[PDB]
Design a protein around this ligand. Structure first.
Ligand SMILES: *[C@@H]1O[C@H](CO)[C@@H](O[C@@H]2O[C@H](CO)[C@@H](O)[C@H](O)[C@H]2NC(C)=O)[C@H](O)[C@H]1NC(C)=O
Ligand SMILES: *[C@@H]1O[C@H](CO)[C@@H](O[C@@H]2O[C@H](CO)[C@@H](O)[C@H](O)[C@H]2NC(C)=O)[C@H](O)[C@H]1NC(C)=O
Ligand SMILES: *[C@@H]1O[C@H](CO)[C@@H](O[C@@H]2O[C@H](CO)[C@@H](O)[C@H](O)[C@H]2NC(C)=O)[C@H](O)[C@H]1NC(C)=O
Ligand SMILES: *[C@@H]1O[C@H](CO)[C@@H](O[C@@H]2O[C@H](CO)[C@@H](O)[C@H](O)[C@H]2NC(C)=O)[C@H](O)[C@H]1NC(C)=O
Ligand SMILES: *[C@@H]1O[C@H](CO)[C@@H](O[C@@H]2O[C@H](CO)[C@@H](O)[C@H](O)[C@H]2NC(C)=O)[C@H](O)[C@H]1NC(C)=O
Ligand SMILES: *[C@@H]1O[C@H](CO)[C@@H](O[C@@H]2O[C@H](CO)[C@@H](O)[C@H](O)[C@H]2NC(C)=O)[C@H](O)[C@H]1NC(C)=O
Lengths: 544, 544, 544
């Protein structure tokens, strides 16, 4: 045809295999989408005469190299460097303590450092070879344009809750940032871990331990399968006995195997390139009146706002407070950001129960969903909390449902609205251990003897009334907090939204705009593997 | 086609891969943009007959070389040489102590010298090969022309605050200087660090320590993987035991590996060239009536002024005073420029609180934003500071917001204006330790017990009222200073804008024209990594 | 095309890569511009038949060579030889003690000789191969012609201060001299430094120390990487222990590495040539009535005068008097020319202050700039110097500013003029140490306690009133001198323009025609790196 293939039949050259203009998810370092365009218009080459480039980029060669002889120690896993995306993870002073905390590389480092009390160590060979950018005169792609008018067309007829669902679908396909800088090259990076007690017993030889690791790295590369290397004489015997694991990885060129020299690895560095860092801008910056020609003036300033709150919602859902200091008790694993809420003693409390009733405000006739909302108290029954309830609001939203009506041969569809709220009970002033509720396997069910019952259409947290077997798996309760109201149990919403000292928060049942939570000291809820990131959508689409 | 490709099909020669005319960011040594043009008009070569050049440059060959046998010691990290941009970082006697203080190379040298009390050492091989320039008869590019009329078209209709936003967008894409000189070549530079106590114990052998380092550098290059080199006999045993780390880097030719001779490295020096220094002029010099033909006379002299204040604003935001001497107490890390404000004892003070109220000057009806501005005192409440307030001004600006009105089928858009100011409270004359405020993890929240509340729509600095747990994380307060007014607490705005001896300034919440600050002696706010540079824009765009 | 490329397709020969006719900056040995022309008119070759030359030059071959066996000692860094530009740096008996004092080569020699009490030593191999010149029948270039009529067109309508700005723009782009002689060739030059005490202890063996250095230079070239060379037997052991550093550089041919014989270096000397000396004439000599045809008679004699004063102004700005003898106290580093003002004892003085007022001579109405000029005394206030003022003039010039007036739909632009002068105070006859002013980090601010305030719109030199902390960083004041008036404090403008014995001058705030100065004995202002040359422009352009 005519296009990309026309240039390769006239010059006999490869194409550069790394371009900017794509999207970039920021909290998971992975690429998707093409938010810009590139058209192989006429013909172009790099000035060295080795590649074929698109029409609007420009390259400036650097041809650098690096080789270090001493490894370095980066501690304190709450702040780290990713060695493949470093210029893009620190910019703009945004909510950046959560940034980069869900990569494939980060979750393997945190799992290693907490099991055997470890600190890490790395040594690399860089070999930078290029740097490309983009000129500021640019257009959007054909794909990104067709789905950008759609969020404007559903917004010009005044439909809130119908554009925010289309907005959160845009972050899933095109990421949060737009990378406009890259640089090709290779690397050869050899990570290592060491025990914590080894680093402290000989502090004066801190320049002598890392000097051995840089010498041992060149013996793994430059020698063959056997062991004729000279590090096994004096000091590497107290080494090689406190390291837990190590791995050598390479992100460029021919695949690495122990036995090639350093000469032969850098010889075949051409035609195998990848980005080793990048930098860009947020997504709410490329929605400009200069960028979109035909859309009107004061309408594109609202599109740039409604896509900003979606990517701000994506940052505030999957974030977790809690303690992070390793030597203290109640060390809350599965917690990325620090809170400083450690060193707090605990005091027990008491809980009453929960019973739900339906309201049915705007449903006059032909509405049958009120008895689905029903849930009674397992201790008393009807509208009589034992002694402890005092009114909070905690929730207000609408649950809709639609039905097909037969009006006759021809059918018109209509829906009905409602309103719902639940209740809760707690200890009143001072009631002794008698008439106390015991609160609750990797199952859908509670342990034996306990009985669960529904709360909010998908979750189950159990209530039980026994005093011989119920203390086998009982956990003390801390208190709910929510989107607007705060926890009244703290400070013995005028207060803040957290949990008192000695407990740990947990997420539960996000529902249409913001989520609710609870906290409970268990010691067993914290264990397990690390959770993946919670991806959008969040709000279910209204059905017109 | 016809153009660049027409010349290469008739001569069979490469193209020179380094040209002037691009932009150059000055405080981060990196390149972007093409503020000049080059058109491959007819045909040209260099007079040696090895490259193809643009139509308006001229090259003068030099063919130099260098090789030194003794390394040198550059101390005092506040002033340094970058070895890749030296002729451009010292010119014009501008605000140049901040110049070059945010490169990739500089931030790695400062981190090494402060951890282990180090001084550096380098030895290089230069091999200069060319020097190109530009003739003074020149035009602007097509891209730079189209975005230069736009800052004139929005200025001819008298819109201040709408051109300064377009001005600060120009510094982001095209840098602060314009490089018109380069010189191709290579290098081979081997940095090294040494302890501070080693250099002082034998001062008479200062010509003998550096003579060994120059001999050891040629053994790493010219010999193979093993160790048959003759430096391990007499004096290198007291060496190789105080060095912390070292790295060999090369910025030209084939990639470096230990084992090539010095002969084979300089043989393949052709077709791999890069700039190793450069020099240029500021950006407010290439806006001239001779440069732009069609724009009128006394209008281009205003464009050259409004782009000068933007690049002067970019230099004065990211700069930090504070102490820099390493041996003294309160050593303020993360501080580039010196102040001389060390050796000052400290005295505690007391702070009262902060409460905010809205004004609503020009909003008669249909304006609902006044209660968003509300913030009350956590100690007293209404308009009654305890004993200490005395009026300062500290701020005056406008907060705008717009709303879509329905005038009917057809919609016209209009906005509303306002004015705001906050308040503050401090100790009056002499009040004892009773009724004193305790002032405040890498989180959005304060530590436990403390409560934060909003100040200026994005920041939070906490107030707390307790006297048992509040002293766990209390910090003494120093005083605010701002854009126009000064700190009255100094000299125990007629005074200057700084903080008394023993504290350290910090930036906070830049808002529309200049920023405010505070200072607090912590000992823990200074630690951490180095911050990246704060890039423009600064002023949010008005919405017409 | 037809031109340069037509000759190379018929003869298959290279082009000579070094031509005269360009410009030449004299105090910085670097090249720019093409003030003459060369047109490859018909065809030509050198008579040997190896190169292609322009139409109006002529070459006379010499084919010389040199090789010396004994190095030589050049002392006294105030006068030196540059070894690449020697015939052009000594001519015409002009202001030549400042000539060549700002090269890249000179600033590295002065830094080495002052740190370790050193004297230099060199030995070279010359190999001259050609010499070209230009016939006196010649034309100007197309580029230099178009910018030469412009300085005449703005001069024929009687605009002083509008042509001198265009004159100083010509020296920036085309240098001060015009080189019309060169000679191609190579070199191989090996510099060296030695201690000062080694040369004096054995004066009788002065022919024996330099005889060893010439023998050791041929062993570095002609032998391989190892050490099988025979200089390590008798006398080189008391050598190689007082040298500080050495470097081998080469400015022609293939790049140098230790290991090629002297045979192989001179074999590939073809097609790699550069100038190793040159000589020319000043720039005010090529503006002649025979040179420019169309311009009238008595008008070109004024153009030759107004460009002579600009290049004389460029020589007198960046020049510094002061002491230069190394063994004496108050050794003023950063001083190129000698003054002989050493060996002078010192006596303290006292200073009063400075207060400024505006005049507003020719501004009747709509002029608002007078209160910007205001600056009051920090000690007394209004028009009352304490006891010491006596009138001098010291300054007279005009500060202009323009404003856009709305006369209506149509706008005409007009400016307003003024006049300004500052004041100063000093000790009267004999006042004791009471009521004395203490006069003042690499910052914009003074040290702590001190307060700065504005003097002349860009500079700040501080005044302070304290007697406990102010003596921490106090410096004694010497006295101002200026363009026309002299210092009255000397000879205890009828006197000269200098500073009494024991102090050191410094430049400050050049403003529109000539600069002012001051002097202060510090001991700390002299330290630091060497400053670069101050480039033109100097006078800001009037705005018509
Ligand atoms: C445009 O959208 C707004 C909501 O953003 C609608 O305003 C609501 O109007 C109803 C009655 O018409 C009120 O009961 C609601 O309280 C309003 N919402 C709010 C948040 O106050 C408005 O009706 C819509 N207009 C059209 C033509 O659809
Ligand atoms: C972990 O490293 C420590 C060093 O910090 C090792 O402890 C030393 O081992 C040597 C080897 O024989 C002994 O001579 C020392 O007496 C040990 N103690 C100290 C305080 O130096 C330790 O052996 C390593 N761990 C394991 C499992 O080998
Ligand atoms: C041109 O811009 C100036 C501001 O630079 C405008 O001057 C303001 O005019 C209003 C009333 O018209 C005054 O209340 C303001 O105080 C003025 N500004 C200042 C800084 O004094 C001027 O109105 C503009 N003219 C046009 C036609 O838009
Ligand atoms: C750092 O260097 C110093 C030299 O300045 C070393 O100190 C000397 O080391 C030699 C080696 O055996 C001893 O003979 C000397 O007695 C030491 N002291 C002095 C004052 O010369 C020091 O050992 C080095 N640091 C380390 C950790 O080895
Ligand atoms: C030509 O330039 C001269 C200055 O070189 C002008 O002379 C000035 O004339 C004004 C009044 O016309 C006097 O007040 C000044 O004192 C004169 N200058 C000097 C230095 O004495 C002259 O006016 C100019 N002529 C024209 C036609 O522009
Ligand atoms: C600098 O050179 C001087 C010679 O001028 C050296 O001094 C002599 O060194 C020899 C070598 O053993 C001794 O035998 C002599 O006694 C020394 N003195 C004299 C007066 O000749 C000196 O050693 C050199 N500097 C250094 C640091 O070695």
């Amino acid at each position: 045809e005519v296009g990309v293939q026309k240039c390769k039949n006239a010059l006999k050259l490869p194409v550069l295999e790394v371009l900017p203009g794509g999207g970039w998810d920021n909290l998971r370092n992975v690429d998707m989408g093409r938010v810009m365009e590139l058209t192989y218009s006429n013909c172009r080459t790099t000035e060295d005469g080795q590649y074929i480039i698109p029409d609007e980029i420009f390259t400036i060669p650097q041809k650098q190299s690096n080789l270090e002889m001493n490894s370095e120690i980066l501690e304190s896993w709450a702040n780290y460097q990713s060695s493949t995306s470093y210029s893009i993870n620190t910019e703009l002073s945004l909510f950046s303590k959560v940034n980069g905390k869900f990569s494939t590389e980060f979750q393997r480092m945190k799992t290693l450092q907490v099991k055997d009390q470890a600190i890490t160590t790395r040594v690399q060979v860089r070999n930078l070879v290029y740097t490309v950018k983009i000129n500021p005169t640019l257009e959007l792609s054909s794909g990104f344009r067709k789905e950008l008018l759609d969020i404007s067309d559903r917004l010009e007829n005044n439909q809130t809750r119908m554009a925010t669902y289309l907005a959160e679908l845009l972050v899933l396909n095109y990421g949060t940032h737009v990378t406009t800088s890259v640089d090709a090259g290779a690397a050869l990076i050899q990570e290592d871990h060491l025990r914590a007690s080894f680093l402290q017993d000989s502090q004066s030889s801190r320049s002598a331990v890392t000097a051995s690791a840089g010498l041992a790295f060149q013996n793994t590369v430059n020698f063959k399968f056997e062991e004729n290397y000279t590090s096994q004489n004096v000091l590497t015997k107290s080494y090689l006995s406190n390291r837990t694991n190590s791995r050598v990885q390479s992100i460029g060129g021919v695949p690495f195997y122990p036995g090639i020299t350093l000469q032969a690895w850098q010889q075949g560095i051409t035609n195998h390139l990848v980005a080793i860092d990048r930098s860009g801008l947020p997504l709410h910056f490329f929605i400009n009146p200069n960028m979109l020609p035909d859309l009107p003036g004061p309408l594109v300033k609202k599109v740039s706002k409604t896509v900003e709150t979606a990517v701000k919602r994506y940052y505030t859902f999957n974030t977790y407070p809690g303690c992070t200091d390793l030597n203290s008790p109640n060390f809350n694993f599965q917690a990325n950001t620090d809170d400083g809420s450690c060193e707090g003693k605990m005091t027990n409390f008491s809980f009453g129960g929960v019973y739900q009733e339906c309201t049915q405000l705007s449903g006059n006739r032909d509405v049958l969903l009120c008895q689905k909302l029903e849930q009674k108290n397992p201790l008393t029954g009807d509208f009589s909390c034992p002694s402890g309830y005092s009114p909070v609001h905690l929730l207000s939203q609408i649950h809709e449902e639609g039905y097909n009506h037969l009006e006759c041969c021809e059918d018109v569809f209509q829906v009905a609205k409602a309103e719902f709220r639940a209740f809760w009970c707690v200890a009143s002033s001072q009631v002794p251990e008698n008439s106390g509720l015991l609160f609750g396997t990797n199952a859908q069910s509670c342990p034996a003897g306990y009985f669960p019952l529904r709360l909010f259409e998908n979750l189950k947290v159990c209530v039980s009334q026994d005093y011989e077997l119920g203390s086998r798996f009982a956990v003390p309760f801390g208190g709910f907090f929510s989107c607007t109201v705060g926890n009244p149990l703290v400070d013995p919403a005028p207060s803040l939204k957290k949990c008192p000292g000695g407990f740990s928060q947990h997420p539960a049942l996000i529902s249409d705009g913001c989520q609710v939570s609870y906290c409970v000291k268990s010691g067993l809820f914290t264990g397990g593997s690390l959770p993946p990131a919670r991806l959008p959508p969040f709000t279910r689409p209204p059905l017109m």
